[PDB]
Ligand binder design. Structure first.
Ligand SMILES: O=c1ccn([C@H]2C[C@H](O)[C@@H](COP(=O)(O)O)O2)c(=O)[nH]1
Ligand SMILES: O=c1ccn([C@H]2C[C@H](O)[C@@H](COP(=O)(O)O)O2)c(=O)[nH]1
Ligand SMILES: O=c1ccn([C@H]2C[C@H](O)[C@@H](COP(=O)(O)O)O2)c(=O)[nH]1
Ligand SMILES: [Mg+2]
Ligand SMILES: [Mg+2]
Lengths: 141, 147, 145
């Protein structure tokens, strides 16, 4: 009914997205995605790449989805917000997912490749059945 | 296929909340998407991140199954003299959560600002943006199975 | 299945919303919407009118929609966000769309009438099939109380 397809673009992303078919059994709404690189976020705006191409599918038809902050993105010591509130991904988009993150604080803050700052939410808030992680060399299903 | 039922269940947790949530069934005949929700207590929010308890337990139900909901700011939250925004753009609550609902509010200004018990800074929106049919305001001292 | 109806309220809106029917051939989720006049946004809160009445309809029934920033609204030289994150428009609202924009920088920033800072997204995120731009000088029952 509702499935995601994630393809790592970079060598760094490959370390975090080994090819795999995840069945979403706890029925999580959002698909957490990694930073894939350590980065230092300056006060103000930061362009943050997510190292992945993503396709979402609902009832067998390619559909859009939304990039949303995870609850832990903003903590007391890290005042980080998604510049656009919600990242709206149109079904026709086939490029790399990109983030704009504002560090509202006065000093830089460190993020680690292992962290998931944001989550992918299918158009319509449909809970995903499967999350397909494709090979870098692979071909989008 | 054609028409589904969507309902919210709000249960007050504190004595302050009982003032704003008398046991009641609210019918949503205006077909508003969101469910306004009170602060219940006067609070001073410091610059930066503030964790605000909402004094309620919330369940959302769609087609008879417990579902998630979304916390969204109301227009009244941010005023010229009170630069307030929801921390995570939109709050995302999973159906399994049965704790007290909490806001993450960022005070963007340099000075402390006040929120007041009677204000609704935020509204609850069912997973998938379904218009609620009923808002059930449950008695405080009750055991309810959906929680 | 899912249609937007946009009606310009002001003469400034008419500069950007000529009467026409737009097809959404790319199947984008959002409907880009213009500022309609040049504005100076001071540091802190700014109330910004959008000069339009909008109705959304899905499967023959009036529904809600959401105002969302476009990723181009915020750049290194203009630190702009929507105060409310997402603007929730109830299916019964038939007045002018209004925006609360926070300029997080320390200096006024200039936005131009032709820029589209936000987009409209149907309730439930349904892809729009048609975007109808209605004539200003007309009363339409979809916008009745
Ligand atoms: O946070 C975001 C928002 C959008 N996009 C991509 C997918 C969209 O289809 C495309 C154009 O978006 P606007 O510039 O029209 O918002 O950019 C992102 O990668 N990240
Ligand atoms: O804005 C929010 C986000 C989350 N939660 C609840 C639901 C989650 O299951 C639980 C854990 O969230 P963190 O401790 O990760 O914030 O808190 C809230 O009450 N408000
Ligand atoms: O950014 C926004 C949010 C809301 N509204 C309109 C549509 C809503 O139905 C109405 C009341 O919304 P609150 O004041 O309840 O957010 O205001 C806007 O014009 N712009
Ligand atoms: Mg309201
Ligand atoms: Mg677009």
């Amino acid at each position: 009914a509702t499935n995601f397809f994630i393809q790592p673009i970079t060598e760094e992303a490959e370390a975090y997205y080994p090819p795999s078919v995840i069945t979403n059994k706890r029925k999580d709404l959002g698909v957490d995605v990694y930073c894939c690189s350590d980065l230092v976020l300056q006060p103000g705006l930061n362009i943050v790449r997510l190292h992945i191409k993503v396709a979402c599918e609902h009832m067998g038809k390619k559909c859009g989805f939304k990039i949303m902050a995870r609850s832990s993105m903003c903590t007391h010591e890290r005042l980080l917000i998604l510049a656009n509130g919600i990242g709206l991904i149109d079904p026709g988009y086939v490029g790399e997912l990109m983030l704009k993150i504002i560090n509202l604080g006065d000093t830089p803050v460190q993020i680690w490749a292992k962290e998931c700052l944001v989550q992918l939410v299918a158009q319509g808030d449909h809970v995903p059945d499967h999350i397909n992680i494709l090979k870098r060399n692979q071909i989008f299903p």
